[PDB]
Amino acid sequence: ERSSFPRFYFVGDEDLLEIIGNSKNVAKLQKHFKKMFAGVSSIILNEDNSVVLGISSREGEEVMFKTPVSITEHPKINEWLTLVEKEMRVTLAKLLAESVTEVEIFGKATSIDPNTYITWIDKYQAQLVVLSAQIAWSENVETALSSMGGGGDAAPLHSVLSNVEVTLNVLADSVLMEQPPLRRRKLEHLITELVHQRDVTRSLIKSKIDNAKSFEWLSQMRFYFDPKQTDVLQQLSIQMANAKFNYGFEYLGVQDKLVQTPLTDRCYLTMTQALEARLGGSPFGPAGTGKTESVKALGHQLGRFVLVFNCDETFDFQAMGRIFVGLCQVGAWGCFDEFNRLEERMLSAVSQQVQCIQEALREHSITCELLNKQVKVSPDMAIFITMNPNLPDNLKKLFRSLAMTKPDRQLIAQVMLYSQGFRTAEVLANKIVPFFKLCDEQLSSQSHYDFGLRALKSVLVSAGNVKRERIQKIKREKEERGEAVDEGEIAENLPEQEILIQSVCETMVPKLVAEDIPLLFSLLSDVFPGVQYHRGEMTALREELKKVCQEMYLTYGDGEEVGGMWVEKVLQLYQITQINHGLMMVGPSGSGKSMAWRVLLKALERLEGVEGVAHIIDPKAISKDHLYGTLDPNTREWTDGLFTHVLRKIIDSVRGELQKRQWIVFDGDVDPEWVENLNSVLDDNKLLTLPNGERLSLPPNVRIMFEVQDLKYATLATVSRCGMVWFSEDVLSTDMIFNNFLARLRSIPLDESPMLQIQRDAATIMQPYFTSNGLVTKALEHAFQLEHIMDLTRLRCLGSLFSMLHQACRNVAQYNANHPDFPMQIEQLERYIQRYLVYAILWSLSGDSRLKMRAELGEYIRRITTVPLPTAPNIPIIDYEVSISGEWSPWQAKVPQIEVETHKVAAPDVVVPTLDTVRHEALLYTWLAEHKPLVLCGPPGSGKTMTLFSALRALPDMEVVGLNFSSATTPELLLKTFDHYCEYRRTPNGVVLAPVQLGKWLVLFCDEINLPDMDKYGTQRVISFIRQMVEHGGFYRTSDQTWVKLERIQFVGACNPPTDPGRKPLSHRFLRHVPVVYVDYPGPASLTQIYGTFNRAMLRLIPSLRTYAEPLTAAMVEFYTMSQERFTQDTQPHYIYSPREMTRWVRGIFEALRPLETLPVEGLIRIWAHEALRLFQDRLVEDEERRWTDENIDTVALKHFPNIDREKAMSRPILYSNWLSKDYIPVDQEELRDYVKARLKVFYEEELDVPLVLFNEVLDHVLRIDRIFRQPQGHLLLIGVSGAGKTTLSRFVAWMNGLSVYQIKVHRKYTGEDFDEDLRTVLRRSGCKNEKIAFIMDESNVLDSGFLERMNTLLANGEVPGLFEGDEYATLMTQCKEGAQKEGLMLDSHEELYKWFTSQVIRNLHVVFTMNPTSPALFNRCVLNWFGDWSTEALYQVGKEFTSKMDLEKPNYIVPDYMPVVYDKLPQPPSHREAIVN
Amino acid sequence: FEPPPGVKANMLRTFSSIPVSRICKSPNERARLYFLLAWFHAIIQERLRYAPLGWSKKYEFGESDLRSACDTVDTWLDDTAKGRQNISPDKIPWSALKTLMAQSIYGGRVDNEFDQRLLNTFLERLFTTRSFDSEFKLACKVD
Amino acid sequence: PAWMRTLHTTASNWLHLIPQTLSHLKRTVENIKDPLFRFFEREVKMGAKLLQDVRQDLADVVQVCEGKKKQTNYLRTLINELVKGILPRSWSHYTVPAGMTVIQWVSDFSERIKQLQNISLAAASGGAKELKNIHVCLGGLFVPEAYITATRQYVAQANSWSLEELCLEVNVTTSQGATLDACSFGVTGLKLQGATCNNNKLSLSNAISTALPLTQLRWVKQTNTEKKASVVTLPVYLNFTRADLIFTVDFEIATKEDPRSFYERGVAVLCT
Ligand SMILES: Nc1ncnc2c1ncn2[C@@H]1O[C@H](COP(=O)(O)OP(=O)(O)OP(=O)(O)O)[C@@H](O)[C@H]1O
């Protein structure tokens, strides 16, 4: 089918099937004609849709068939398509012929009537009038050289050049006045081509060429049209140098005209010579030199497409192969870009493909193998590749080279300025081009700076527009004042350097940083001396900006007043909107970019009567495939993407959105991954290319803006293609934020009035402290000097302070509500508000730092404030609070003294209140009341999770859903959570996401909010996604690309400091919204209180020891204090400590005191020492450290228990075992050794038999392993060199104590899913079967960090919610239900059975980690054990035990004079065997 | 395996590469002008060895450039002389060859303006109608 | 290891060789108006930053050599690059010859820092007016084309002329016998290769390179007159590899000389 009429081969199988199925549906065929034809967007038909009347371009210009093609006469698609193309070519040829006749009538004339010329231009297409001018000039000059062929005669070239000059004069006359944009483009193209013709004709005049066959004329591109030629193809031939080209005669429509610089002419010569030799060209060179534009212009001058593929790093092949084979069949040209950027395999594949294509082209001087198919390559094929510095080795022979080192910017500026109608274009160009060179060189380098040739072209076009507008304004003024109107006279006296400077300023000042504006003005003075510009203030826009700022509670100013810089930035944004379609506000988060453009849109809507609507799309949250559109690889159905969907909605103009001003803003970071498709939109063509092959013209009212906080990772191609507005942080001064907060407080209520009155009094009270250089400003400035666990942003602190002041107002309202008879008076309100403001500054400016920095801020503010403060000699203000009565009351009073039950000792549910806990709960409720997301960041342990969970369960209407973020977390996790716990509902406002159960505020607690890894471009998808809902209050449902409003949903996060390994610092744009509180390690007083409560709960089992709870807890916290102080993390990476160690300590003491009904204080001291040795002594490495711990535990026991005997309570062999007796009791080491040798023999008999020797180190290690395997949540970290016996000892203990061993069988294919499945199976066997499991883990088994995260969650919470979901969750609950029935518990609801399963897992599962000497978080969740290496004693014992069978007994042996004594305890006479073992 | 250095060796290589029939065609001056082209190519390629001085960078003045130059030669000599046995040196399209081998061939790889200037100097010194005299100097003051 | 001691020795030697510190230029509004001051301040800032980076680099390498510092990833690639003897990527911020080794680069950097220190001292002693009267080697500067542009800016701003209407005149005189005109700037270190210049007249010679004593760059109004047949346009390359094109000079060849011979023989002016 495709063999006949190969022109339609360009489209793929999708469009082929679409055109076959809808062949009768010509109205759906316009997309195809957009795909192949050149200027065509649709074919013009009648009302019957049965005869192809004509063709139209995408701009609006159309051609009429001399003989329209009737589709009814040719029902076959290919036949009528061929007829349509043949008739289009014939019509183009006939129109060209009669246009050439008309221009010949114009030619050889002393003067030209402007009306006739403009009529001829309007009658015809831009390409056709340009071609007619080319043909006329070539024919006239050819006849002229024919005339001077005699030689030494008069020169009619002077007459031809004079004719061209008078045509230039009338052209420059025409473009000065207002013209339609299409006529403007035609006039500009005519001017450019005629300027080139004048230049080449003057060159011929200077060279005194008198022969028509002289090469100097032959090199110039000549056009030769033959009206009498029967074939329309052969009528016009484009000959230049020795090459002969036939016109493509394809309707190119209207396209940008490339000026004909000498470099471009050389490019034409080289490329035409290459095509004559039947091999393409390779115009290499640096970026921004117009090589691709040169290819485009050469193709257009020959009436052919080029398809400039973009060879980015992310490059396709299947669609790439399709477009290649389609091009080869059709014959339209193909061009490359940035070829060397391709991947090496990608480069080789494309090199082979184009090598085959080029070899076919050479053999044509015909079909070739392409995609396992035969492709007919037209003779007129060409292919070009542009490089950036070489060609691949297989292509160096087949492809001519050309150096696009630099374009002629001076001549480009001259020609384009002449095109705009500027007089004295030469001077202006020779001034502007060096000025841009200086700006590129002298100005400070920045990411968003761009002074390339494209910027120059935009500047010159804007200058032409501004000159036209000034001329129109002068014409209107002359109409009002007087009646004398003449375009020439107003053009003559119009300054032009002023106009150029105004355009340059309007374009470049917005993108300049604060210190570069004086440099720019110095450069302007250096290049344009003595001439200056004055900014024309927009009075109406300033008035309406003031009005909208008043309505929106924003502060507004002019010039040097408050907000003047912001207002100027908004006006600059307005100008950039006027002169550009693609904007980009670049600046640090917190400078007001969002509000700047929002206020600008509102003011514009209230100004021009054009209602504005804004679509906010976050590129990073949504996958690029969903962002732009999905093409099914198999079913080949096209699902339009988010940006594609909004563009299509704009195009359709269903509800008059075309009349509206619609702004698409890409709020979010930018990287060269998705913006590569947008590069085709930000440029001059402005079209939405789609993988399906569809093209969407950008409407004039559509603007694309990227509100990016930085441009470090953005490629220069994107920067060069759009306008830049720089929003420095200085733009939004602190006073502006203070005024905005106060205005919003005074105007809007918090509930959605008495409380409004309360807000007004509160604001009146705090106004003195919020002024310039007030208390808050100085406090913030000092707080910037401190150090914070996260990077400090001004807006983060200010927003947290504003929210907590809102909570202060809420507290005042609640007090007034609860005391109706006595509402709070003015004086008490003032006292309360002042004290709360001081306390709020304290806990907001330094709420995310250590205690010392908090004390520094407290002492600073005490120095600088006049508000009354507590008179505590040393207790800082932070430990105090502000009561509802406006008095300073210590937080200690609010702290209660609860008594936890015995069976709940150190249970996960229990949360003993304390100072840290109560303060963090208060602040948490404060920031939850305003529904502001918050992050709890602190060192491993410290009870961040328990504090958050207890505070969240405390309030009744707030449900909690825990989300364990991993290193591979993606937003799909959040979508799945939303699906599980929420539902989509349709509301009059729009689609709304809300929790399924009514009247509840869901919290998506994120345990590790900074764990997920950033991309190669420094962006975390989940973080930007959460920020998108935090700031915009919603997101886009990617299923149908609809904005979804969040209702009754809020986020709360927790994390570790970013300095910890595996932690990525959060984005400032996210940090700005989330206040952060630093949950440091609880102080000695807090630990004393909580674990004193735990000890008082524990000791009730034995009444005779109740009186010793307090000294026991004091000794515990004291020893833990020195343990933390001495064994710092710098010595070893695993030398960490936390309250989790104390919880394990109390849990172990409980578990070993419960079996014993009665016990004297000596036994309690012994058991306490045993647990202390097993927790804070075995993790050590050096023997000196162990001796230090033993000495300090001795001193602690003596100090806190003086009335005890050290020998009984602290006998050195502290060895406890359940093997001998029924209870867990001390035993002498000899019985332990004998019993464990017997058990080793039984281990040989039953399990794998390998000879194991028993040395004392193995005794101690087996005791430690048994002790942990006995405990609930007993997780061991066996740290030691390989082969020491970690795995074997673990298996031996597991076999002896009855726990079934379990090891992973990890191979190279073992991906994550297998690990989740195996963890599932282990969890089922341990919780649902009541069977203990010994999980042996080794770091060799770990293949990625995600395994570590899953294990870490398992160690911390006792289970991980990730494994069991849906059907697996139902199967697990079936197992748990049957297991509970067998055990004897009746439970029905989901949560009770899940809790029982978690309790079973924590009581049963024991996982042991074996590593060979590292997240500190992992260390804190296990009791680290130092296996180390076998010592000399150990090696000697192995040697003797193994070589006891051999008989090395030599009586002849005599002891040496000196005996090597490497063994520490060698017997004084070495016999032979001990000598050999030594 | 690397080519032997020397203008002589390069010239023998060039002449052996080109077939017998192509050089001896209807215009008897085609052989002379092919000799001039071979001498120019040899001079350029041997100057490539002294890269800091003879040029600005190691260009790829390979055999493909020579083949393209020979093709341009054959096409232009065919066009100018339509099957004529003898052609005057003045009628030889010298300017066409000079511009073609200064911009398209041997010049496409030239990015530096000064290398282009040197190439133009070489072409205008060698390719001229004055060359067809017995007193023509292919080089001056060799020793 | 022996290589460790050798690296310690060479790092100590380079630390001794390279000067200690570089002083930034004091900012002033009048100095901000002057373009030469702006260019020299940018050069001083870049040189001082690079010098501080290199000194902290060498201190860290020496401390690793003692053994009190662990070799980080940056320090590890640094040390590998040092022992293999190639130029570190972080150190090289300005355009450099491809084949120059580390020792030559360190000597060149020391010379550049010495020149920058002299320039900063001269600027501090006087001001922009004294800054105009400094003979500066184009090779020593990081961006000599920026210096050419700065001289053009200064001449244009002094006489209220447009930048585009100024052309460059080169006068080659001895350092002692030179006149410092208001539009003349002294440039040293330019080496002429393939020809000898006497009384601003080029002559072909067989010498490998002739050292120009003091090249004076004079910016004059465009006379709009065609250049004479005896003038030659010579490139000014940054280094001997001829990979950087700073600017083009115009020289008057002597009688009977052929400019075509000047073009063929590869006559050029080198900053270094
Ligand atoms: N003209 C103004 N006067 C006073 N306060 C303002 C003004 N414009 C904005 N603000 C306030 O300052 C902050 C600026 O917020 P905005 O989102 O506009 O900044 P941004 O830098 O664009 O942020 P981001 O990069 O996070 O989107 C807000 O708290 C806002 O209320």
Ligand SMILES: Nc1ncnc2c1ncn2[C@@H]1O[C@H](COP(=O)(O)OP(=O)(O)OP(=O)(O)O)[C@@H](O)[C@H]1O
């Ligand atoms: N208020 C409290 N109530 C109960 N236990 C507490 C409290 N404060 C601290 N702890 C103890 O602190 C330890 C750490 O608690 P938790 O496990 O919640 O830390 P985390 O924040 O999850 O740590 P990570 O940084 O590893 O996420 C526990 O052993 C716990 O018993």
Ligand SMILES: Nc1ncnc2c1ncn2[C@@H]1O[C@H](COP(=O)(O)OP(=O)(O)O)[C@@H](O)[C@H]1O
């Ligand atoms: N001769 C010319 N006439 C008009 N515009 C030109 C010309 N040469 C280059 N340009 C413009 O200058 C820029 C350089 O083209 P571009 O394709 O970006 O260069 P490169 O492919 O080298 O990166 C483009 O904006 C292009 O339109």
Ligand SMILES: Nc1ncnc2c1ncn2[C@@H]1O[C@H](COP(=O)(O)OP(=O)(O)O)[C@@H](O)[C@H]1O
């Ligand atoms: N106490 C011991 N006495 C003798 N051999 C032992 C002992 N412990 C371990 N081994 C030897 O170590 C081997 C197993 O080492 P393994 O424990 O897997 O190394 P790792 O300690 O790195 O896990 C066994 O073959 C066994 O012979």
Ligand SMILES: [Mg+2]
């Ligand atoms: Mg946690």
